[PDB]
Amino acid sequence: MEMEKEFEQIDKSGSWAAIYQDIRHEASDFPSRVAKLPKNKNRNRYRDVSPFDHSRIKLHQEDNDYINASLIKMEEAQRSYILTQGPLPNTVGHFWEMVWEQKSRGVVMLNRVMEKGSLKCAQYWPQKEEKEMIFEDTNLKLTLISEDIKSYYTVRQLELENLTTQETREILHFHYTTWPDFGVPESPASFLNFLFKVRESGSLSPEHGPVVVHCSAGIGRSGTFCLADTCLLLMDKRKDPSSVDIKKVLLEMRKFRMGLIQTADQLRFSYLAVIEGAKFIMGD
Ligand SMILES: CCc1ccc(C(=O)NCc2cnn(C)c2)s1
């Protein structure tokens, strides 16, 4: 069923809450036993958001391999994403270790450091060229190379140095800065264009490790980003683009990380983004 028609049918009937609860009921439940070990309590931002054991990212160290991060592997779309929480003061070194070990080119940030008067994630990248950051626990150095500030997003070029081998890599930081403190954006235009800029960069392409995507919990806004990207890629690839079922793509993604899409308004916004993305790209 053409999703644009499915959309108007749900909107006219006002059933968004009912569709959303059906997804919550059918979603996968897998064990998260490593996340719940007492040694990992200060590595988790939220008690109710944990990576599944089968899909968690492992840090390459013998001490403690745990980070709150999941590999989402979309077999038919041929795309992989790492979805993670906003780093905590004691996990900023783990975060950059993961970026290094997984060979990621891009980090996608969908939140502000402060929202609703509270801290949503650590200040985990340098704000001035001449004031670099060193992560002594993981032996990494991070330098700001350049910054491009636009109305709806900022792109940063960063240099990450493995202090152990003196290898360096360029990491691109894509920071969507205008998601509102309350609700979802009214139009999905700035969002869909932001994704276009990430795609243009090569950060999502198979010659690199998976993109790292985060918000505060790494399930809501982060969920919206990967769901929209995968659905638009499948509409490009298939003979019948009307066959793409956004509810079935979201349940597939929920096999790899719990809770993706946190509200009925985020579900509606995801539909709007894919539709508007579709109608915009199909011919243009
Ligand atoms: C209603 C106005 C819109 C703004 C953004 C839209 C989108 O979905 N993608 C952006 C974009 C740019 N270039 N390509 C290929 C995609 S639609």
From Swiss-Prot:
Query: Residues bearing Cysteine sulfinic acid (-SO2H)?
Result: C215
Modification Phosphoserine, positions: S50, S242, S243
Which reaction(s) are listed as its catalytic activity? O-phospho-L-tyrosyl-[protein] + H2O = L-tyrosyl-[protein] + phosphate
Query: Which molecular function GO terms apply here?
Result: cadherin binding; enzyme binding; ephrin receptor binding; insulin receptor binding; non-membrane spanning protein tyrosine phosphatase activity; protein kinase binding; protein phosphatase 2A binding; protein tyrosine phosphatase activity
| Gene Ontology annotations of biological process type | actin cytoskeleton organization; cellular response to angiotensin; cellular response to fibroblast growth factor stimulus; cellular response to hypoxia; cellular response to nerve growth factor stimulus; cellular response to nitric oxide; cellular response to platelet-derived growth factor stimulus; cellular response to unfolded protein
Give the transmembrane ranges: none
Q: Which UniProt keywords apply?
A: Acetylation, Endoplasmic reticulum, Hydrolase, Membrane, Oxidation, Phosphoprotein, Protein phosphatase, S-nitrosylation
Instruction: Extract one GO cellular component term from the record.
Output: mitochondrial crista
Post-translational modification as stated in the protein's UniProt record:
Oxidized on Cys-215; the Cys-SOH formed in response to redox signaling reacts with the alpha-amido of the following residue to form a sulfenamide cross-link, triggering a conformational change that inhibits substrate binding and activity. The active site can be restored by reduction.
Location comes to:
Endoplasmic reticulum membrane
Sites bearing Cysteine sulfenic acid (-SOH), chain numbering = C215
- Phosphotyrosine occurs at Y20, Y66
Q: Quote the function comment for this protein.
A: Tyrosine-protein phosphatase which acts as a regulator of endoplasmic reticulum unfolded protein response. Mediates dephosphorylation of EIF2AK3/PERK; inactivating the protein kinase activity of EIF2AK3/PERK. May play an important role in CKII- and p60c-src-induced signal transduction cascades. May regulate the EFNA5-EPHA3 signaling pathway which modulates cell reorganization and cell-cell repulsion. May also regulate the hepatocyte growth factor receptor signaling pathway through dephosphorylation of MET.
Similarity field: Belongs to the protein-tyrosine phosphatase family. Non-receptor class 1 subfamily.
Self-association or partners: how does it assemble? Interacts with EPHA3 (phosphorylated); dephosphorylates EPHA3 and may regulate its trafficking and function. Interacts with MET. Interacts with NCK1.
Q: What is this protein called?
A: Tyrosine-protein phosphatase non-receptor type 1
Of the intact sequence, the residues represented are 1 to 284 of 435
